[PDB]
Design a protein around this ligand. Structure first.
Ligand code: CL
Ligand code: CL
Ligand code: CL
Ligand code: CL
Ligand code: CL
Ligand code: CL
Lengths: 488, 480
């Protein structure tokens, strides 16, 4: 019924409380895995629809290749309940693993896909080839887990393409990346930084890895929001995926992979959450409005029930989903808290002092600003409000993000900024040994999760690099500006 | 390259041939597990979309309960490992010994159902399962690998629940008939055929003619309070008295794809109702003289544009190596609803040939009238497909009254409609005597369902087996 830990002071328990007490998830008694209740799934359905539309515009074609992961990752269920997640249940009776270990570690159809691709691509006429699929996997949950965020249970999407060029493929990679950005912004009202990964933090089979980075202020921790890989000809060469060009001479396809996950949900939740509880941006909230009757002393309760039902009509007629809470058992206060907690964007309160006034009151979930509004304005005003709540969420989020970055030019400044829950943006020479040197040094200077500072991304929107500038670590000429930060 | 079997000479190897060469699925490993290439997935995605829409209309929320299938009555639900504590109740039969996903769900529901305000509860979820394929498989029909949708609901009154069951059943009918152009019959399953746990089971039944066998297309159970009593799923009503919920459960499977193919499949290959084919039109250029070449390509291109401009997904096959016959076969194999041929005579007469996939009937067409006529032709293709599948269906259902009429009607590969006792006693005796009198992975003769659309039952009027007064007409035949 209420939230005991304050977000800014006991973050982890705050998150726990919020997601279980907001009817988002439900834990099974066994395996520590959770049910995505309608409340949670709805979000996924929204972003899923969005993505599908947008990649259809990109001539991506949905499909399904059976997922493979090495047997070893599924043993904990095999011993505990003798059952596996249905999407990868075949991989046990498979026996010996195959082929490269670098991909078998993670559930994917890449192992299968790449295997059948050379038979699908023989001519240049067969390119470009653009596939997508939606996946769900669940393994025996971590001992100390964080739903959406640090968990073995996932619901995600993975795309794969093959091209005649590198230009084609890379363009595509960044197109997808910007779709992930829109994914987070237009729908989860979450801001992210577009960037390229350090050579040590990139995917090994990748030429380069582009990422969307998000940042949790209350933790002072960054977390990867989405990834788009330019794979190059690595796996073409590896799997003999060649085609015959227009001049009719055999050449290697250029591939890309990309994927975003239910992680996004958790990230959203961490971005907008109150001590009051859940705050959904309206696009991903099943009900946009809850309608509450306020009355204690005896009155025409019927008159109100009707007035309210009239508002509910006005709105459900605009395909704006409402819930009217006329429960007799609970105080108007109880209700307030109950739906504030479940993350409903707008609450309309109806009072006897509003039926003779023919108005009502509307309250925003995000800033709890109240206002008085006439009945005929209700629909309009509610709409404009549902837009504004979103813009506002995205703003406060963005500001927090912007405030969490410190531009340093030397290592002196680093640790300070770190302990203030900030990430730094620093002139790096991007040489590799320095990654591990910086990890080890920053781990050694700090007071679950790690304290070592990792290179997160080289952001696409680069600050000018002075001709002089040295790497804040090596003292070599700095190559580019890089985000370092503690992370998930 | 092409189907070396005919549909009505060896049905099985035909079907396998068609599903693998039409590029709907592909097999990689010894497993026999298969990739769902974009063609199949297009279909599944269409019916998925329709269904999500229409059930949202019924305030059904999509969800996701994680599952752990244990290898290894199947219906749509797989047998799952138990993730909650079962409580002392269980049951004398079935229940815990062999649990399903539904069963886990129910084991969770009491938490979500306190009072009458918490009802109705209405969940659906979409699923994907890939286990090690059967020794002797039949993809989309007898396969341990498939996609499906399963929904469940809880209600205050029996009426609420039942009404929803038949709502869903009609949705299944529209699933089949509107979108797949496959005609089904709605009925209630027999008492010794009904789901173990249901008050009653309604079913959408389809019938493959060339093969003489009927098959369950979809399913919509009304469960009453049996699982409610078992798991104690009770709510306080308006008067604070505890009451058992009134459950339903329905599901449909990628099975439908299997059905659809089987219903429209040519000896030429796959045949799709234009709804569910990505490319609606293929365009083929016809010439040997190079003089015409550059100038034909333009013509084609123009048409391509004309159709693309109008949101009509098209392919323009101008592969210079392959013969036109190769292409005709190739794109017929893939069930591309329409082919447009362009040769020199079409440049001259400012026309172009248009070929219906369903009946291969050609016609010349004014190059501007192409668009309209093409739309109308896709529509009549869908309608025609349905019409034909429907009449084929009719022609394999016979109405009969005696035992001999029945038996005769059967190894004439028909499906029969006979007067019946509805006595569950009689049925397995029916099955085994009928199997013994005649004449893979199945089978005998089962009662399929008692249609909702009942003909007049004469007052006369004896059953066909027992001779007892017949209660209603029932569908009988062999199944999948
Ligand atoms: Cl393209
Ligand atoms: Cl662990
Ligand atoms: Cl752990
Ligand atoms: Cl309802
Ligand atoms: Cl078998
Ligand atoms: Cl078997």
């Amino acid at each position: 019924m209420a939230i005991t830990s304050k977000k800014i002071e006991n973050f982890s328990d705050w998150y726990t409380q919020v997601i279980v007490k907001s009817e988002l998830i439900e834990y099974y008694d066994i395996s520590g895995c959770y049910i995505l209740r309608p409340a949670a799934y709805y979000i996924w359905e929204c972003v899923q629809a969005f993505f599908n539309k947008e990649i259809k515009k990109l001539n991506v074609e949905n499909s399904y290749f059976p997922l493979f992961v090495t047997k070893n990752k599924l043993e904990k269920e095999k011993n505990h309940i003798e059952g596996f997640s249905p999407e990868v249940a075949w991989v046990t009776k498979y026996g010996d693993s195959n082929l490269p270990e670098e991909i078998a570690i993670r559930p994917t159809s890449e192992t299968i896909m790449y295997s059948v691709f050379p038979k699908w691509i023989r001519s240049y006429r067969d390119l470009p080839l653009k596939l997508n699929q939606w996946n769900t996997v669940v393994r025996w949950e971590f001992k100390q887990p964080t739903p959406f965020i640090r968990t073995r249970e996932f619901l995600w999407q993975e795309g794969h393409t093959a091209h005649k060029n590198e230009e084609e493929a890379v363009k595509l990679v960044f197109d997808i990346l910007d779709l992930y950005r829109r994914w987070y912004e237009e729908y989860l009202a979450v801001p992210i930084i577009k960037g390229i990964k350090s050579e040590g933090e990139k995917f090994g089979g990748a030429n380069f890895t582009s990422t969307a980075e998000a940042f949790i202020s209350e933790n002072g921790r960054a977390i990867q929001a989405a990834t788009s890989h330019y794979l190059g000809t690595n796996f073409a060469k590896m799997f003999k995926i060649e085609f015959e060009d227009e001049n009719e001479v055999k050449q290697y396809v250029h591939q890309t992979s990309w994927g975003c996950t239910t992680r996004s949900i958790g990230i959203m939740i961490m971005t907008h959450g109150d001590d009051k509880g859940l705050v959904l941006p309206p696009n991903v909230s099943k009900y946009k409005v809850v309608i509450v009757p306020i009355f204690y002393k005896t009155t025409d309760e019927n008159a109100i029930h009707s007035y309210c039902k009239d508002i509910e009509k006005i709105l459900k007629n605009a395909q704006i989903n409402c819930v009217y809470d006329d429960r007799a058992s609970y105080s108007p206060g109880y209700k307030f808290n109950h739906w504030e907690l479940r993350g409903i964007p707008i609450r309309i309160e109806v009072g006897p002092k509003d039926l003779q006034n023919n108005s009502c009151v509307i309250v925003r979930r995000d800033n709890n600003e109240k206002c008085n509004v006439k009945k005929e304005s209700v629909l309009l005003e509610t709409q404009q409000m549902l837009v504004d709540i979103h813009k506002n969420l995205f703003l406060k989020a963005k500001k927090k993000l912007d405030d969490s970055i410190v531009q340093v030019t030397s290592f002196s400044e680093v640790m300070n900024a770190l302990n203030k829950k900030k990430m730094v943006l620093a002139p790096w020479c991007e040489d590799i040994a320095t990654e591990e040197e910086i990890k080890k040094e920053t781990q050694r200077l700090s007071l679950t999760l790690s304290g070592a500072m990792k290179p997160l991304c080289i952001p696409l929107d680069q600050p000018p690099m002075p001709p002089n500038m040295k790497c804040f670590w090596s003292g070599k000429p700095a190559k580019r500006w890089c985000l370092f930060g503690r992370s998930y």
